[PDB]
Write a protein that binds this DNA or RNA. Structure first.
Lengths: 346, 694, 341
DNA sequence: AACCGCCAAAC
DNA sequence: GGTCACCAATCCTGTCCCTAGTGGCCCCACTGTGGCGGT
């Protein structure tokens, strides 16, 4: 097909905001607060001592023993606090069935037919399992993940209560216990229903409980300061302002969303790595695009061949032994992610 | 000052930048009396693009343009589109119209294009924006403001040499001179009213007149050149494509400056005699201490035209207002203290710091009651001893009059309080009058730009028009004939609203009219909460016909204000928001319970002869604001196609001054002062319609 | 006919809808927006491809780089149970007679058409549609049915209506009896306000939404095409409170656009309800559902008022037959208001 | 001839 | 049955330091919002 002047999708997954707190005998919510610490840092960089041609600079013998004055925000667990709690809410809507905006009615009707054919093949089941699996193993804790024995407790709006006793036992590829697979099975069915039924209103309350070590360091979201003054801190944290007047140290909604949608390992047949769902499959560690524009694996190349993929999906239910093309699984992960997939008027 | 005073710079970039700034209408006019040839080269090199010209003093590409009679033809095509008033401001959809008229009648209290000599701007078509610069750029000749067409119209012999210095012919030059003199801007009035021109209804002889307000190029250009010099408080209005608007807008990159003087109402903290000493007519030391006098005694003895006693009374008339102003200044801080001590019954700003401040909320100024404190006065007499140390430190103590000033302050005490004044008024009639008090009115997104010069409060003509619409609906509903003669306006809350307004899709005009979005016009918008007091006249038959129907009075209250949406106070506020009053004491007893942070919008009687006097007068007093007063008519009322009414007229928005007086100042100044010097009326005359006092 | 520069004031006057929450201390704490700076991926078509769909000559790690985004965000504070969205609504009778006209012939025609449309009970149907848009919480836009929403309506008359849960209601679904009673009563009050110029009618409408933990709020976004390098590229419409705090809010025109999403007469089997427009402009598709070349647009229908007058004068007597949907669309546009040439 | 083109820069 | 006693007092003498230093990398968005004369 042809890409329209307007072609929008609203995202399906809505993580609220993950707030770090702890509990006393008095209060069931005491917010974990950051404080500005001024520490002494050395001159350890390449450019401090060397030219771009790998020749030593003309510096005094005492210049490399001098320090940089660092103004950093620190977050530690208070002494003799046993457990730390990270809590966020997740709402799931059915926004991948119909584009939010579309200029061409032939493109609109085609994308509506593709979603309905993908729905009856049970394609949303496989995608819901991968989103659910990221919640149970605690991918969304990022650098706090498996720093202690973590218990994840999930309360859905249906009235279901799910419990993972220890996330250290679980992994993505490892063989799970009977009770842990039952939690993955039941919660995936509730997400699939929310992804596919516009009449269904579904939300979950997800809480991690981590066995804290003595005065352990917390790793929340950092704000993007490109330019910094000498007074203010070079490293600052994302904060949720509480109703009284206190700032709980927090994760961004987009940070939590990036963890849940770390499901893309279709880019190679023997791919070990799971990427955050991107149009070009950007690998931030290796610094390469795993779905380059030159390749047919990038989103815009797959999206223009959607007529050919709709043909293969209609031969899927007639057998239901042959699996769905991984290009189609990747396709619907981008529509669930949402975005603006617009070319222009030539 | 002179042309080649700026040509002394060896760096061509700095030179040409200063020259392009010099010949732009947002700067002062340079003298070209000595330099006519070089002036013609740069003025004719300005006709090109910026990226087409390296240096403006290149003689050859000037001769390339001058020799080419496809280039000069375009420059003389653009003379017919020279306006005194820009019809394309701010909406550029006003299609192919030009308004060129003489300035209107000169008025003492308002500012318009009447206060300046007749200058021209250009506005036709963005493609030809450079081609106008040759014949619309203003310069200083001998000792006279002039542009190229006007100076070549008659005095050609002075410019013959300058034009023939490049190698232009005499035949071509004189044919150019006669065609330019024949193609001079005539008295251009459009034959029809445009679809996108704004029309309003103003009250004419025995009916209504359709009025289109158009900005003047001169007053705008003066405000722009005043804003670049950083002389007053200004805010910005940005345009997308400024060349389509005008040349003045094109010269400034579309960033037009407007006079930003909004009301400042704060809910928060109170932090001395401070308010007096700050008001500085007033006190501490000087402007104008000390009288020490001699000054006051000499003034009285000069006014002794007509008998020493009768003179002292005539001196007093101005000198008592001046002596009253001294007491009013002194009372400004006594007002603040009292104020706090009410809200509180606790506090000042700082209870101890107040008690410490020589002229603050003392438990001795606490009372006795207001009423009994004024009846006592005593406090006022004591404060005269304190005014041996502050309210004029040392000098001018027994000196011409200090006793008379103390007596005036002791009299003011009686006036400063309570349960006193009360009755007897030629206004309105009486047979009786009525006072309609509208309280706690909330407005969302009203136009802060009163006229396209001034930003702050909405227009007083907007408040008048709303009140007139309310009158018309009530008189047509009840079948009565009451008149809503005057109003007083008290602002409780004010806040500026960020962002522009997105226009909806419509058939936008072209060769083929297409359904699309129009151009996004930048504006200024405010959320405000206010009270109105309307003064109703008529027969008691009609008044008691109005008073008998409270629901029908409430029903016809308009929901529009200056483009914004106007609502009564919230249903859980427990505020009766539409009250009628027969007497003035009951109304003033209701009105002195207003929030103290709010501001009365008060009419002044200051005279202004040009912008610089207004700016000096604004730099003088911090509580004055330039605002829209009304319309100075340019053309004569006549039948025009597209008019709302029978007769249509083009008018100019007139800039006046209002005062943001505190609630306390109006409370202490007395009932008589409030009912005489707070009420607005529309003075509707033959050639002007202006908001004024009485 | 042309009608010679005809002019109508709008009938519905909504105010700014302000978002806030309640503590055990205060009954109004304003919901404030914070500026956050986040990474964005280079994921657009133009980042990687030419307009002929050919790969651009870029570095191998240009698509792994980020855009630095400065955005405004509004979240519910932690352990706040309910979000409150409140606005005021005024209704005046501006649809009966044109406010500005030239010809008294068309003035007499339109006034006669208005009062004969009133007598057949067309204003009741339009009032029902406007009221139904108020009750299901269309005016919450993207906050609609994100939690269990309870809508309270207080009227200047002295009435007090309550919808318990807006998740149980739709446009096409069959309601409970009490919710239909609320619809009926409030429709009667709105119809009375639309039809009679000599009554005052105001309403304070409050939605109470059961908030999820640190849930995102979706207020009105400002129009800005000249944003600076220092400022946020996405900002929200704010309302200043009694103190120096700004509550995040909806525009009046945003609420107005939601209430007047009643037009589904543009097709024989139209599922979508358009915002009442002279050419039936669809924001999602970006086409006109009543195009200028068709007979379905306002300026085509408005020329047949003399025939619609005859139809209504037969409809008033013949007791049962439904009104032509063109006349419903006609009066919906007259209630919207504007200048018609 | 209906539709691509011309045109600006303040602090 | 009701109030919270008056009369005066706020100390003088000397000083706030020295050394050294506030990092590298990459990036800051795509959509739309024009009047007017002419070939």
């Amino acid at each position: 097909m042809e890409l329209c002047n307007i072609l929008k999708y609203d995202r399906s997954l809505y993580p609220g905001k993950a707030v770090f707190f702890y509990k006393t005998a008095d209060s069931d919510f005491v917010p974990l607060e950051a404080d500005i610490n001024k520490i002494r840092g050395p001159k350890s960089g390449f450019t401090e001592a060397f030219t771009p041609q790998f020749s030593p600079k003309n510096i005094s013998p005492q210049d490399l023993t001098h320090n940089n004055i660092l103004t950093l925000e620190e977050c530690y667990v208070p002494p003799n606090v046993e457990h730390i709690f990270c809590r966020f809410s997740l709402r799931v809507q059915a926004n991948s069935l119909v584009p939010s905006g579309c200029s061409d009615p032939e493109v609109f009707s085609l994308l509506k037919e593709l979603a309905e054919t993908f729905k009856e093949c049970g394609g949303y089941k496989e995608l819901a399992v991968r989103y659910c699996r990221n919640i149970l193993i605690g991918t969304w804790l990022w650098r706090n993940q498996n720093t202690g024995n973590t218990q994840i407790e999930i309360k859905t709006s249906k009235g279901s209560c799910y419990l993972i006793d220890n996330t250290r036992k679980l992994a993505w590829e490892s063989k799970w216990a009977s009770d842990d697979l039952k939690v993955l099975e039941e919660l995936s069915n509730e997400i699939e229903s929310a992804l596919t039924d516009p009449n269904v209103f579904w939300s979950a309350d997800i809480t991690a409980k981590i066995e804290a070590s003595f005065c352990q360091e917390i790793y929340p979201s950092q704000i993007l300061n490109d330019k910094v003054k000498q007074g203010e801190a070079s490293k600052q944290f994302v904060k949720a302002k509480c109703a009284d007047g206190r700032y709980a140290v927090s994760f961004n909604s987009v940070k939590i969303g990036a963890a849940l949608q770390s499901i893309d390992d279709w880019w190679d047949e023997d791919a070990s790595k799971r990427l955050r769902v991107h149009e070009f499959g950007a690998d931030k560690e290796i610094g390469v695009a795993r779905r380059p524009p030159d390749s047919e694996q990038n989103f815009y190349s797959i999206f223009k061949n959607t007529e050919w993929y709709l043909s293969a999906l209609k031969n899927c239910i007639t057998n239901k032994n042959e699996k769905i093309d991984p290009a189609i699984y990747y396709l619907f992960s981008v529509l669930i992610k949402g975005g603006m997939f617009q070319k222009k008027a030539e | 000052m002179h042309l080649k005073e700026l040509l002394e710079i060896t760096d061509t970039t700095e030179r040409d930048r200063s020259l392009r700034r010099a010949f732009s209408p947002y700067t002062a006019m340079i003298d070209i009396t000595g330099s006519e040839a070089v002036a013609l080269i740069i003025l004719l090199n300005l006709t090109y693009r910026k990226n087409q010209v390296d240096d403006l003093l290149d003689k050859k590409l000037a001769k390339q343009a001058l020799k080419s009679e496809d280039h000069i033809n375009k420059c003389i095509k653009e003379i017919a589109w020279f306006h005194t008033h820009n019809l394309k401001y701010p909406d550029i959809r006003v299609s192919k119209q030009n308004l060129a008229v003489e300035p209107p009648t000169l008025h003492s209290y308002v500012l318009s294009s009447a206060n300046y000599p007749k200058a021209y701007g250009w506005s036709h078509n963005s493609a030809k924006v450079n081609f106008a610069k040759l014949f619309v750029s203003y310069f200083k000749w001998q000792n006279q403001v002039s542009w190229l067409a006007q100076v070549l119209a008659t005095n050609s012999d002075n410019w013959k040499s300058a034009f023939t210095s490049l190698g232009l012919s005499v035949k071509a030059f004189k044919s150019l001179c006669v065609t330019v003199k024949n193609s001079l801007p005539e008295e251009a009035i459009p034959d029809s009213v445009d679809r996108y021109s704004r029309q309003i209804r103003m009250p004419y002889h025995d009916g209504y007149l359709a009025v289109t307000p158009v900005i003047s190029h001169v007053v705008q250009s003066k405000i722009q050149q005043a804003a670049i010099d950083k002389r007053a408080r200004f805010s910005n209005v940005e345009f997308t494509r400024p060349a389509a608007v005008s040349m003045l807008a094109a010269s400034l990159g579309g960033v037009i400056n407007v006079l930003n003087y909004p009301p400042y109402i704060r809910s928060k903290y109170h932090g001395s005699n401070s308010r007096a000493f700050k008001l500085n007519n007033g006190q501490t030391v000087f402007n104008v201490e000390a009288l020490l006098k001699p000054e006051l005694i000499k003034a009285l003895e000069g006014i002794i035209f007509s008998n020493n006693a009768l003179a002292l009374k005539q001196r007093r008339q101005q000198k008592v207002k001046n002596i009253k102003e001294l007491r009013n200044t002194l009372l400004e801080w006594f007002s603040p203290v009292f104020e706090w001590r009410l809200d509180a019954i606790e506090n000042g700003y700082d209870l101890e710091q107040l008690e410490s401040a020589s002229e603050r909320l003392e438990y001795k100024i606490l009372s006795l009651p207001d009423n009994e404190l004024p009846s006592l006065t005593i406090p006022l007499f004591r404060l005269l001893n304190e005014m041996l140390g502050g309210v004029s430190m040392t000098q001018r103590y027994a000196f011409h009059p200090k006793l008379m000033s103390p007596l005036k302050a002791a009299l003011q005490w009686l006036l400063v309080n309570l349960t006193d004044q009360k009755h007897v008024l030629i206004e309105e009639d009486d047979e009786h009058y009525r006072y309609l008090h509208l309280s706690g009115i909330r407005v969302f997104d009203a136009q802060a730009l009163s006229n396209p010069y001034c930003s702050g409060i909405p227009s007083l003509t907007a408040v008048w028009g709303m009140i007139h619409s309310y009158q018309r609906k009530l008189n047509e509903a009840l079948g009565t004939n009451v008149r809503f003669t005057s109003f007083s306006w008290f602002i409780r809350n004010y806040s500026a609203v960020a962002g522009k307004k997105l226009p909806e899709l419509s058939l936008q005009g072209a060769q083929q009219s297409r359904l699309k979005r129009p151009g996004i016009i930048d504006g200024k918008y405010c959320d405000l909460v206010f009270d109105l007091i309307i003064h109703i006249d008529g027969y008691e038959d009609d008044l008691q016909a109005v008073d008998s129907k409270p629901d029908i009075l409430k029903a016809h209250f308009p929901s529009n204000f200056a483009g914004g949406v106007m609502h009564q106070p919230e249903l859980n506020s427990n505020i009766n928001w539409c009250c009628l009053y027969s007497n003035e004491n009951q109304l003033f007893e209701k009105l002195r319970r207003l929030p103290l942070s709010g501001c009365w919008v008060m009419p002044t009687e200051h005279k202004i002869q040009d912008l610089d006097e207004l700016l000096l007068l604004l730099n003088s007093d911090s509580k004055l604001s330039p605002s829209m007063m009304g319309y100075m008519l340019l053309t004569e009322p006549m039948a025009r196609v597209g008019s709302l009414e029978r007769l249509h007229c083009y008018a100019e928005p007139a800039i006046g001054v209002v005062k943001y007086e505190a609630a306390t100042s109006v409370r202490l100044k007395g009932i008589g002062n409030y009912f005489n010097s707070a009420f607005w009326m529309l003075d509707a005359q033959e050639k002007f319609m202006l908001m004024k006092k009485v």
